[PDB]
């Protein structure tokens, strides 16, 4: 959509050069072997590697020199939004399933409210491993009809 790749972005190169020039301005103030100078020299390399990696991944830059993210579902940009999205969904489902399974276990007690303050660690440690298979567990429970009260 009028976007150019990072590796061929003159404004991207200008941003990198300007940041490096600004960083090197403070390097001249200290002795070359001093600890502040050693710490500063490690910052320039980090900037260089970051810019190289951004160029190497085929990110798209506009007229500003800043990368843009395409989330329409293009197969060449699945790492921007699609790939991290499924990971977040899996992790959030794990957390939710563990939290839901803990409450059901203690609901049958005489005083279920007491277990919400003093957490039963031996009981909680067993349920934690069970969240690994939460997609299959939820898929099977939905079909059987036990998901909704």
């Amino acid at each position: 959509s009028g976007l150019t790749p990072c590796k061929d972005s003159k404004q991207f190169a200008k941003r990198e050069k300007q940041q490096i020039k600004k960083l090197e301005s403070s390097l001249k103030l200290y002795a070359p072997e001093s600890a502040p100078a050693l710490a500063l020299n490690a910052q320039i390399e980090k900037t260089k590697r970051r810019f190289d990696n951004y160029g190497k991944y085929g990110l798209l830059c506009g007229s500003d020199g800043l990368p843009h993210l395409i989330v329409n579902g293009d197969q060449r940009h699945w790492g921007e939004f699609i790939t991290p999205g499924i990971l977040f969904l899996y992790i959030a489902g794990w957390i939710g399933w563990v939290g839901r399974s803990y409450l059901i276990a203690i609901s049958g007690e005489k005083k279920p409210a007491m277990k919400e303050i003093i957490i039963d660690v031996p009981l909680a440690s067993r349920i934690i491993f069970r969240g690994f298979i939460w997609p299959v567990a939820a898929y099977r429970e939905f079909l059987n009809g036990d998901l909704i009260a």
Binding site: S26, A31, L103, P112, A113, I148
Partner: protein, 709 residues
């Protein structure tokens, strides 16, 4: 059962009077709590002393105080946050501090980083000792009630021992360590060549070379030939030209005199040996011409109640803190403090806020005492009864003064603004059209300037340089102190201060007086000190308790203090602080625009808020960007506070009902039923966020502005 129990658990954690009704147990708990607080303070001091030894540029600053910015904090390079390590000079990178710790250490004679390590270790040991003492005195050896009620012995020891001997010991330290080391430093001697402090004690001719009077020994003290000690015990007055602070010899003499006076004052109250007065006898026997009977009955009230004593102490401490804040900017006690502007602005604002908070606490605890501990049957006092019998006249007169002051202090600003907008500058209240000169303050300034040499023969100079008639003081090309002019712009702002203080006093005093009962709710005492309302009857009785009066007074305290610090900042930036060229021409930071721009509300919006906020909003990408980030974050908290202040409780309970239904639909309903916040809690949450946001915004603005310029 419900979620309000969790909130109630932390609300009454330190209310010992509700837990038990026995005075002995409350007293023991109070003693142990004080021990714990002392331990925490010692741990904080240990941390502060240690950080300046390992992660600071103290030595480089000591070799060049003027051109090096103090620093004691360093950041780890994790997420790119190491941009906060600015170039503060001295071959060091870190965050510039504004607590004035380097000046204290220099004035105490510290020259190396080995002494700071020892001080940190000692403070840590003392913290451990205090914690153990608290545990011991609560669980093993708890005193009796009769021990706590011996107020004649407490005053004697707290005057003679704590305050009398501390000043004497500090004067000894000053005389023996601080004077010679500072004299060596002021002479241009390199810090690593200065002899160690114990060489002065062990070798006496070294001290005799600097001060010949040390050769005579202690004989002149005993022979009453005290004129020989005038070498290091002076009465000069004024600031030190080399450093810009008070002479250390003056401080030593002052501490010696204070110690002697306090030691004399500590032998007044009667104890086992039968010499001295009794407090009860002094209170009872006192009957002047208008009191009549007197103060008979206050001894029991003040010895059987903790809230009255707490209120009195809080009020006194708040007033003392405000006085301390005022007295330190005009008579700088530490070297190289006046010419370092970042610390001067930070020390004035800190203690003002502390004093205001402590005063509001005094009002709150007086209200608590009136609600709970008041007893006209067993603890009758006459003066309190007479004050309670004409409370209608007190409040109605205090209500009138607030209206008069508000009109005659704010309508002048509005009139000036309108006349300026209508193109009629000859009709404003200013130095060129209609003058309202503060003649009394100018007379005071002239009298204090002329006091030396006439009414103070022993004084060689005035106490401070603010009184017009003195000479300018310059340290390292910067302006330290000079006479402060007073004009029409200073007439209006003082009356603004008076108006705000009077309104705050009105709110707090009304709450305290009507805590017990009023014409609307005769039985308000039975409802308690902290209750929301008494229903929608009588047209509405929202916020009738004393707790709500304190809640309202916090807003006005915050409003009053904010104007003071703005006045100080603009007046000092525009009329005192600046730089001096080689030929003696002073150029102030803002070029003296306070006189003409600070008479209209547009001047404060354009020349102060708009013009001086350009430093914080341009801090992105530099080492001051943390201030730019905190500037925006505090607005969010301040605006977030408004949700709790403007809204009610029923709407949120119904919303939570719908949410709980949606949770019940999926068998994730907690057994602890969610509840919305109570009426009182919703008020307390709002004001906390309001104050936090406002104070943080002002803090970031001030710190980002003054460090850059």
């Amino acid at each position: 059962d419900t979620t309000t129990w969790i909130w109630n658990l932390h609300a009454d954690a330190h209310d010992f009077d509700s837990h038990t009704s026995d005075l002995e147990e409350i007293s023991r708990k109070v003693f142990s709590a004080h021990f714990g607080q002392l331990s925490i303070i010692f741990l904080w001091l240990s941390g502060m002393y240690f950080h300046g030894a390992r992660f600071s540029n103290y030595e480089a600053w000591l070799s060049d105080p003027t051109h090096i910015g103090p620093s004691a904090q360093v950041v780890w390079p994790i997420v790119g946050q190491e941009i906060l390590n600015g170039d503060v000079g001295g071959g060091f990178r870190g965050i510039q501090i504004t607590s004035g710790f380097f000046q204290i250490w220099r004035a105490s004679g510290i020259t190396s980083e080995l002494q700071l390590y020892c001080t940190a270790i000692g403070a840590l040991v003392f913290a451990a000792l205090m914690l153990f003492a608290g545990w011991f005195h609560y669980h093993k050896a708890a005193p009796k009630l009769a021990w706590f009620q011996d107020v004649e012995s407490m005053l004697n020891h707290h005057l003679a021992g704590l305050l009398g001997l501390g000043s004497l010991s500090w004067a000894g330290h000053q005389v023996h360590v601080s004077l010679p080391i500072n004299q060596f430093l002021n002479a241009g001697v390199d810090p690593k060549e200065i002899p160690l402090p114990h060489e002065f004690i062990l070798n006496r001719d070294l001290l005799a070379q600097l001060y010949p009077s040390f050769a005579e020994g202690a004989t002149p003290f005993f022979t009453l030939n005290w004129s020989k000690y005038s070498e290091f015990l002076t009465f000069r007055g004024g600031l030190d030209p080399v450093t810009g602070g008070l002479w250390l010899t003056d401080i030593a003499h002052h501490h010696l005199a204070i110690a002697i006076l306090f030691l004399i004052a500590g032998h007044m109250y009667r104890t086992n040996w039968g010499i001295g007065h009794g407090i009860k006898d002094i209170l009872e026997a006192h009957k002047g011409p208008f009191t009549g009977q007197g103060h008979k009955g206050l001894y029991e009230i003040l010895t059987t109640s903790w809230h009255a004593q707490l209120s009195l102490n809080l009020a006194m401490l708040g007033s003392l803190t405000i006085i301390v804040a005022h007295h330190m900017y005009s008579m700088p006690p530490y070297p190289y403090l006046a010419t370092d502007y970042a610390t001067q602005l930070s020390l004035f604002t800190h203690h003002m806020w502390i004093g205001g908070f402590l005063i509001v606490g005094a009002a709150a605890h007086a209200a608590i005492f009136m609600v709970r501990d008041y007893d006209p049957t067993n603890r009758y006092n006459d003066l309190l009864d007479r004050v309670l019998r004409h409370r209608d006249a007190i409040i109605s007169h205090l209500n009138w003064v607030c209206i008069f002051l508000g009109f005659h202090s704010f309508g002048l600003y509005i009139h000036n603004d309108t006349m300026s907008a209508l193109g009629r500058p000859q009709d404003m209240f200013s130095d060129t059209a209609i003058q309202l000169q503060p003649v009394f303050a100018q007379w005071i300034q002239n009298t204090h300037a002329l006091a030396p040499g006439v009414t103070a023969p022993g004084e060689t100079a005035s106490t401070s340089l603010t009184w017009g008639g003195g000479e300018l003081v310059a340290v390292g090309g910067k302006v330290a102190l000079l006479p402060i002019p007073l004009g029409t712009a200073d007439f209006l702002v003082h009356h603004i201060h008076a108006f705000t203080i009077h309104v705050t006093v009105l709110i707090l005093l009304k709450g305290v007086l009507f805590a017990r009962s009023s014409r609307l709710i005769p039985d308000k005492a039975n409802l308690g000190f902290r209750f929301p309302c008494d229903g929608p009857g009588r047209g509405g009785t929202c916020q009738v308790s004393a707790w709500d009066h304190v809640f309202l007074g916090l807003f006005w305290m915050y409003n009053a203090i904010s104007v003071v610090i703005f006045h100080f900042s603009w007046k000092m930036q525009s009329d005192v602080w600046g730089s001096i060229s080689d030929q003696g021409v002073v150029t102030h930071i803002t070029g003296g625009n306070f006189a003409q721009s600070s008479i209209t509300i547009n001047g404060w919006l354009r020349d102060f808020l708009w013009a001086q906020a350009s430093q914080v909003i341009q801090s992105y990408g530099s080492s001051l960007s943390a201030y730019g980030l905190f500037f925006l974050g505090a607005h969010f908290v301040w605006a977030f506070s408004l949700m709790f202040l403007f809204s009610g409780r029923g709407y949120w309970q119904e919303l939570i009902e719908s949410i709980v239904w949606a949770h019940n639909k999926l068998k994730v309903a907690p057994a602890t039923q969610p509840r919305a916040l109570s009426i009182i809690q919703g008020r307390a949450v709002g004001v906390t966020h309001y104050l936090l946001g406002g104070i943080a915004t002002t803090w970031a603005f001030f710190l980002a502005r003054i460090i850059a310029v």
